[PDB]
Amino acid sequence: EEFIFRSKLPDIYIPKNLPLHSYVLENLSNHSSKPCLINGANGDVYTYADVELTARRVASGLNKIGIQQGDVIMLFLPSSPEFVLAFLGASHRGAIITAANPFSTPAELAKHAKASRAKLLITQACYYEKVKDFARESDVKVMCVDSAPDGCLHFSELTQADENEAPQVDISPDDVVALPYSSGTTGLPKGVMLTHKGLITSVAQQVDGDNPNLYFHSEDVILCVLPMFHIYALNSIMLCGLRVGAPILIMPKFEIGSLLGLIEKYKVSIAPVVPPVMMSIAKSPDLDKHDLSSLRMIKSGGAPLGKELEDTVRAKFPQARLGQGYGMTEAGPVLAMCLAFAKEPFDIKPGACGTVVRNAEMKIVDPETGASLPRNQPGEICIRGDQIMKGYLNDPEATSRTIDKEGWLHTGDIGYIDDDDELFIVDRLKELIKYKGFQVAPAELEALLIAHPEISDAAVVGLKDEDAGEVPVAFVVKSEKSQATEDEIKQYISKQVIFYKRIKRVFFIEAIPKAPSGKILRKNLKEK
């Protein structure tokens, strides 16, 4: 009956005519000599001035090697200063950045490059072997940041290019700048088109305003142990950090012992994490061997946070305020943010994932009738605002079933909003499986299984797991006289997919339960 929810914070001014790099580096002059990017693994450091200049050099270098405005560049790198420099340089060039986990298989990397139409791939030499075959076969340029195996280019060709040769580019706020992949509410992984305006809006919703929803001040140091090739770290850590002028302490590889030492050494104050990471930190027996007094904020997002883990963290890190952030790639990605993180904080309740961001609208709809619901009534969470995606790359039908005719993005998540405007996520409508914060699309694994000569049908479902949250398991229908075993099938999948998409168990059945239409009755399967 038309119930629209909004933030408890007032709307603020958000630019509608600026390129992403111009916006996040807008107040550069106020802290140009300050550390911007710090590699916690090797000590490398770039000041804000260094970053701004290098981004322009990268843009000049990209043009020099034939990369044009509108072209897609694919990063195959771990979180690092290099990733950020490449991203900002591409933005300055009017180019687009798509990225994949460097631990992806050769099959995944090629499929990603082909689907995104990447014209350049940037990675590390230790991962080059996985792109070699594809490289010298698709005419795509390959570049490495360390050594330059074969005839690949070197990243210095970009970082050390002449900034005076940076091409003059006219960038529209509606131009796409990032292309993260996501399976959305159903189906296979798709390219999510995020624009300059969309990302700017999402960043502003989090850190701008007299009373920012996510308050980061001058003395803060933000930890980046999450992957920049995914939206959480890209937006809430990288872009938000740059916008507020805070130094970003990057950890290319998560290691408890090292992290604790880095927190003391660099006085890390903000720790954006995911449940799996939080649990590892909590189980650490060395918390007393380091001074972690600088930590003042721990933000969990990307997956459900159980009460027990929430209680454990509050008990082990009493010097910090614990809270959640709720986001979805297609949403820009932040939908709601803990108001206890605001400059002038609001009270919050345990288990809540935050309050809908300002400069946006949220509604909860009955999954079957589409009707809007009032407070305390669970339904599908929908959001509308300039921060959402433009749409899915080359996939109009997927876009049409995700963003409705009135501009509302449908999340596939079930939740409700209480009397204090705090949002609670209680279930999931969509088939998405989440392993340690990573997306595991059942349809993707299903397609791979069915491609097997001895498999006629299959269905993949998520199995509850204390350590990863959910682990994928498969129900398989073998061909008539197949002698294939559980382990043989698992090995078949393990060789083609990234480590976290491996199927934990294979159950053989006679048929996959489907609706009269043909849709897989996943509810039935999960029910064993």
As annotated, the binding site for AMP includes 230, 325, 327, 329, 413, 430, 434, 439
Coil, strand, or helix at residue 46?
A: strand
Please report whether residue 191 would count as binding ligand AYL according to CB under 6 A.
no
By CB under 6 A, name the one of 304, 306, 345, 378 that touches ligand AYL: 304
Please report whether residue 385 would count as binding ligand AYL according to CB under 6 A.
no
Please report whether residue 325 would count as binding ligand AYL according to CB under 6 A.
yes
Q: How many residues bind ligand AYL (CB under 6 A)?
A: 23
* Spatial CB neighbours of 45, under 8 Å, sequence gap ≥ 6: 35, 37, 38, 39, 81
CB of 423 to ligand AYL, least distance (A): 9
Complex with ligand AYL: residue 274 or 449, whichever CB lies closer? 274
The interface region with ligand AYL, picked from 58-66, 99-107, 299-307, 389-397 by CB under 6 A, is: 299-307
The interface region with ligand AYL, picked from 10-18, 166-174, 296-304, 456-464 by CB under 6 A, is: 296-304
CB of 334 to ligand AYL, least distance (A): 5
Which two three-digit tokens encode residue 525? 């399967």
Complex with ligand AYL: residue 124 or 182, whichever CB lies closer? 182
- Cβ proximity of 143 and 120 under 8 Å: yes
Please report whether residue 389 would count as binding ligand AYL according to CB under 6 A.
no
Dist CA 288 CA 318 (whole Å): 13
By CB under 6 A, name the one of 88, 224, 303, 512 that touches ligand AYL: 303
The CA–CA distances, whole Å, from 310 to 172, 284, 299, 345, 463 equal 42, 16, 11, 19, 22
Complex with ligand AYL: residue 295 or 352, whichever CB lies closer? 352
Q: Say which DSSP state 386 is in.
A: T
Please report whether residue 205 would count as binding ligand AYL according to CB under 6 A.
no
Binding residue ranges:
230, 325, 327, 329, 413, 430, 434, 439
The interface region with ligand AYL, picked from 102-110, 129-137, 241-249, 320-328 by CB under 6 A, is: 320-328
Calculate Rg over the CA atoms of the chain. Answer: 23
Which two three-digit tokens encode residue 211? 């009373």
CB of 502 to ligand AYL, least distance (A): 18
CB of 182 to ligand AYL, least distance (A): 5
Coil, strand, or helix at residue 235?
A: helix
* Backbone φ, ψ for residue 166 (5° rounding): -60, 125
Dist CA 417 CA 470 (whole Å): 26
- Cβ proximity of 239 and 92 under 8 Å: no
Which two three-digit tokens encode residue 347? 């009270």
Look at strands 72-76 and 118-123 and give their pairing.
parallel
CB of 208 to ligand AYL, least distance (A): 15
Coil, strand, or helix at residue 17?
A: coil
Q: Say which DSSP state 100 is in.
A: -
Complex with ligand AYL: residue 52 or 380, whichever CB lies closer? 380
By CB under 6 A, name the one of 173, 212, 241, 302 that touches ligand AYL: 302
Please report whether residue 439 would count as binding ligand AYL according to CB under 6 A.
yes
Q: How many helices (H) does the chain have, and how many strands (E)? A: 16, 27
Which two three-digit tokens encode residue 114? 């082909």
Q: How much helix, strand and coil, in percent to the nearest 5, is found in the chain?
A: 30, 25, 45
Dist CA 25 CA 32 (whole Å): 10
Complex with ligand AYL: residue 98 or 329, whichever CB lies closer? 329
* Backbone φ, ψ for residue 476 (5° rounding): -125, 140
Within 393-432, the residues that bind ligand AYL by CB under 6 A are: 411, 413, 425, 428
CB of 194 to ligand AYL, least distance (A): 12
The interface region with ligand AYL, picked from 12-20, 325-333, 370-378, 498-506 by CB under 6 A, is: 325-333
CB of 424 to ligand AYL, least distance (A): 9
The interface region with ligand AYL, picked from 40-48, 160-168, 302-310, 393-401 by CB under 6 A, is: 302-310
Within 210-269, the residues that bind ligand AYL by CB under 6 A are: 231-232, 235-236
Residue 157's closest CA among 140, 169, 143, 147? 143
Dist CA 407 CA 363 (whole Å): 12
CB of 111 to ligand AYL, least distance (A): 18
CB of 164 to ligand AYL, least distance (A): 37
The secondary structure of 184-230, three-state, reads CCCCCCEEEEEEHHHHHHHHHHHHCCCCCCCCCCCCCCEEECCCCCC
Within 334-363, the residues that bind ligand AYL by CB under 6 A are: 334, 353
Strand order in the sheet with 361-365: 361-365, 379-384, 409-417, 423-428
Please report whether residue 182 would count as binding ligand AYL according to CB under 6 A.
yes
By CB under 6 A, name the one of 78, 89, 301, 379 that touches ligand AYL: 301
CB of 437 to ligand AYL, least distance (A): 7
CB of 170 to ligand AYL, least distance (A): 30
Look at strands 118-123 and 141-144 and give their pairing.
parallel
Complex with ligand AYL: residue 89 or 209, whichever CB lies closer? 209
Torsion over CA: 115, 121, 127, 128 (sign):
positive
State the number of CA atoms in the 13 A half-sphere of 40 facing the CB: 29
Binding site for ligand AYL (CB under 6 A): 182, 231-232, 235-236, 301-304, 324-329, 333-334, 353, 411, 413, 425, 428, 439
